[PDB]
Amino acid sequence: GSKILISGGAGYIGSHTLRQFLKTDHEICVLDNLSKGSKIAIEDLAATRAFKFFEQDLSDFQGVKALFEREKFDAIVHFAASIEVFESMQNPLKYYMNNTVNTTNLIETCLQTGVNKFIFSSTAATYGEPQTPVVSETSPLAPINPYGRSKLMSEEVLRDASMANPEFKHCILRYFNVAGACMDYTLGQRYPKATLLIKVAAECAAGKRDKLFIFGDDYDTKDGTCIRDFIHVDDISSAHLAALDYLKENESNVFNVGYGHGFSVKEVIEAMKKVSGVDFKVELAPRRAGDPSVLISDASKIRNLTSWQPKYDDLELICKSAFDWEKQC
Amino acid sequence: GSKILISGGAGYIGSHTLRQFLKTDHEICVLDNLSKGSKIAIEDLAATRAFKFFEQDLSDFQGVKALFEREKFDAIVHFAASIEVFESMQNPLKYYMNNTVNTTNLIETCLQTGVNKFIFSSTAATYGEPQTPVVSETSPLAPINPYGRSKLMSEEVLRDASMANPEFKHCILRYFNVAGACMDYTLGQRYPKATLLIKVAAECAAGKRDKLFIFGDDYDTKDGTCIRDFIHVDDISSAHLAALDYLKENESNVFNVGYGHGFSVKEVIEAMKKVSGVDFKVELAPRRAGDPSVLISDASKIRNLTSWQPKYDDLELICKSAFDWEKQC
Ligand SMILES: NC(=O)c1ccc[n+]([C@@H]2O[C@H](COP(=O)([O-])OP(=O)(O)OC[C@H]3O[C@@H](n4cnc5c(N)ncnc54)[C@H](O)[C@@H]3O)[C@@H](O)[C@H]2O)c1
Numbered sequence: 001g002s003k004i005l006i007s008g009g010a011g012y013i014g015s016h017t018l019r020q021f022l023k024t025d026h027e028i029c030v031l032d033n034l035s036k037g038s039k040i041a042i043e044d045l046a047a048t049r050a051f052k053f054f055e056q057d058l059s060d061f062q063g064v065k066a067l068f069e070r071e072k073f074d075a076i077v078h079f080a081a082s083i084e085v086f087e088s089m090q091n092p093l094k095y096y097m098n099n100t101v102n103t104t105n106l107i108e109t110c111l112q113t114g115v116n117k118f119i120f121s122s123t124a125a126t127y128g129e130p131q132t133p134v135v136s137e138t139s140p141l142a143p144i145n146p147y148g149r150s151k152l153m154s155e156e157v158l159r160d161a162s163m164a165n166p167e168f169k170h171c172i173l174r175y176f177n178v179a180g181a182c183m184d185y186t187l188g189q190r191y192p193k194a195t196l197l198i199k200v201a202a203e204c205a206a207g208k209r210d211k212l213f214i215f216g217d218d219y220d221t222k223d224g225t226c227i228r229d230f231i232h233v234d235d236i237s238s239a240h241l242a243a244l245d246y247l248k249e250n251e252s253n254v255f256n257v258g259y260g261h262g263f264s265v266k267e268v269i270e271a272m273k274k275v276s277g278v279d280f281k282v283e284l285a286p287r288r289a290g291d292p293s294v295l296i297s298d299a300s301k302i303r304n305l306t307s308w309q310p311k312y313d314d315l316e317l318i319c320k321s322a323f324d325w326e327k328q329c
Numbered sequence: 330g331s332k333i334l335i336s337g338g339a340g341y342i343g344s345h346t347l348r349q350f351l352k353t354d355h356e357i358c359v360l361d362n363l364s365k366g367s368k369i370a371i372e373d374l375a376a377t378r379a380f381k382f383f384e385q386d387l388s389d390f391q392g393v394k395a396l397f398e399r400e401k402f403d404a405i406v407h408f409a410a411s412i413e414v415f416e417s418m419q420n421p422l423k424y425y426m427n428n429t430v431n432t433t434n435l436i437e438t439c440l441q442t443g444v445n446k447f448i449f450s451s452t453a454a455t456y457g458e459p460q461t462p463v464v465s466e467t468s469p470l471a472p473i474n475p476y477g478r479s480k481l482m483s484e485e486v487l488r489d490a491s492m493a494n495p496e497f498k499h500c501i502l503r504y505f506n507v508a509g510a511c512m513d514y515t516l517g518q519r520y521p522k523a524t525l526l527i528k529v530a531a532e533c534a535a536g537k538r539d540k541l542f543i544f545g546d547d548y549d550t551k552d553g554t555c556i557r558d559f560i561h562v563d564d565i566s567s568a569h570l571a572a573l574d575y576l577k578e579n580e581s582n583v584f585n586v587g588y589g590h591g592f593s594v595k596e597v598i599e600a601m602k603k604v605s606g607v608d609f610k611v612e613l614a615p616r617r618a619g620d621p622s623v624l625i626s627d628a629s630k631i632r633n634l635t636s637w638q639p640k641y642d643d644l645e646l647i648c649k650s651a652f653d654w655e656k657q658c
């Protein structure tokens with residue numbers, strides 16, 4: 001099958017996507033500098049099928065160009081990035097360098113070496129603070145932090161690349177938080193945004209965080225608590241495969257990836273407690289001014305245009321996954 | 330005196346800005362890879378007063394860093410860029426690499442080595458196709474070509490840099506076309522927009538283009554032809570000195586640089602013919618689709634907030650400068 005490069009393939013979503021790709025007939029290559037990635041995940045999957053692992057940094061532009069000249073990829077699935085909003089506020093240049101700059105060279109290199117299918121892991125952070133509860137791909141791109149801006153800039157480079165080079169196809173995926181992701185800057189936030197609800201719930205259940213606060217229980221929602229968008233690592237993983245499949249006969253596009261509905265704070269707490277067996281401390285607090293009652297992706301486009309079908313839209317499974325991965329963080 | 334680095338100092342505006350800086354008490358350095366800039370103009374100024382010249386390419390990040398770690402600049406005036414809208418349309422990655430990417434490393438390097446004053450040469454192209462005849466610093470930033478996007482991206486990195494690093498001050502200058510600028514790639518463009526009219530007129534007078542079109546003479550303007558914004562190379566150069574001065578006692582800012590009025594197509598044509606003594610072919614055509622009657626900078630902010638004062642707001646002197654430099658391109 002086709003030759004695919006997965007950048008960031010040693011990381012959380014990349015390695016899960018790697019595992020799924022290995023069950024296909026594609027020829028698989030992986031690039032990762034192992035900055036956050038783990039070699040052991042890689043070795044463990046090499047004892048499944050063979051794939052080339054390139055321990056290379058995307059900031060070495062010549063090394064990237066040469067890898068691409070030698071290997072002649074048909075596609076790249078690009079996960080490599082720095083991913084923490086809080087860190088980006090403190091250290092914006094790290095985000096513009098590791099995300100926007102490295103991605104820009106990567107795109108130029110794709111163009112020079114005939115890599116004409118590019119799947120880009122973008123983010124819902126590109127929407128900033130959306131003015132609707134269910135965000136569609138057409139909502140304004142108005143990021144409010146350097147992480148969000150750094151990703152939007154790469155989206156815009158991809159768009160210009162495709163317009164100048166009709167043969168070059170990109171598919172951009174945006175999504176909210178993925179359960180089980182290890183973030184170094186979350187535990188130090190006492191009152192994180194509700195978009196990090198599963199991470200916080202997992203941190204409490206693992207005895208890492210002392211209390212979980214519910215900010216407001218009188219919203220116009222099912223149970224009065226906030227509704228947010230979370231996704232299983234294997235479901236966001238499969239959507240990247242679906243995105244590549246989509247680029248076979250279809251033109252460039254951008255898709256939200258999500259279940260098309262959210263989960264409430266109350267639901268996540270109940271599920272996390274049940275699945276972990278830990279009755280961690282939760283306290284009711286007043287509404288936090290500015291917090292929308294509902295913020296989720298509109299996933300109708302991806303359902304409509306691709307073969308993507310999630311199979312872990314199950315809060316207990318998602319919380320279990322987050323819990324298990326949390327203890328590894 | 331303060332130690333100042335002028336990136337792109339061998340180029341058109343950079344060399345005229347360098348000449349003005351050499352009159353001050355500042356320790357001046359110039360960085361340029363001579364990809365377009367002339368070492369000739371450099372040597373013939375390095376006679377007048379002594380300045381350090383570094384033939385260094387901004388794409389070499391480690392070399393830029395070594396240089397900055399050694400020299401410990403107090404300020405940078407950053408002109409180095411690729412500058413052709415028409416070329417950016419055909420080769421967007423050249424523009425994202427040479428502009429956004431190189432500038433991003435430059436900014437990180439400034440932060441790492443204490444360069445806490447950054448004057449950036451941006452562009453009216455950040456405004457895109459404005460809804461108003463006159464554009465102020467608060468007009469929406471909606472560039473419509475990769476050149477304009479590449480510059481806007483860098484303005485955004487600067488904004489984030491100063492937010493996370495209060496000691497780091499930036500001043501951004503936006504302006505329309507500078508009379509006399511070489512734009513070799515666009516000579517291959519049949520119908521440049523009216524914003525490039527003075528250049529097209531110069532090219533006709535120099536015999537490099539056979540013909541010049543006037544698209545519409547029935548607009549609601551003094552003489553019925555389009556009105557656009559042009560500036561003398563020495564006036565935009567002084568604005569850059571003013572910007573650095575402004576930063577001594579003030580926080581980061583952005584200014585338009587302009588005369589506060591425009592010049593009509595007809596006036597530019599007649600002045601170009603007068604100055605050059607060449608009665609080149611002018612052909613009158615219908616209105617061109619998308620053409621606003623008027624498009625100029627509101628420059629009231631910079632007048633009010635800085636010491637900047639135009640010295641050569643004279644259509645004849647501007648066309649003479651354009652014609653003289655045209656033959657040098
Ligand atoms: N909740 C989420 O985790 C989430 C949500 C939305 C979007 N995303 C996006 O999905 C992608 C992956 O997310 P993740 O959770 O797997 O993060 P991750 O940190 O686990 O994966 C990133 C991988 O890329 C590698 N990498 C980073 N910089 C590199 C460089 N300069 N050169 C070579 N390799 C490099 C890291 O070592 C790592 O293995 C990112 O693009 C991120 O922005 C993630």
Ligand SMILES: NC(=O)c1ccc[n+]([C@@H]2O[C@H](COP(=O)([O-])OP(=O)(O)OC[C@H]3O[C@@H](n4cnc5c(N)ncnc54)[C@H](O)[C@@H]3O)[C@@H](O)[C@H]2O)c1
Binds near residue numbers: 361362364
């Ligand atoms: N000329 C105009 O009409 C106009 C209008 C608005 C804004 N500007 C801006 O002013 C600045 C300078 O304009 P200009 O007309 O003098 O252009 P220029 O081409 O004459 O000068 C640019 C200089 O930067 C140098 N340079 C380019 N890339 C480099 C790199 N990677 N490393 C080291 N040096 C490099 C070139 O060699 C050159 O001497 C640019 O940033 C441009 O965007 C120009």
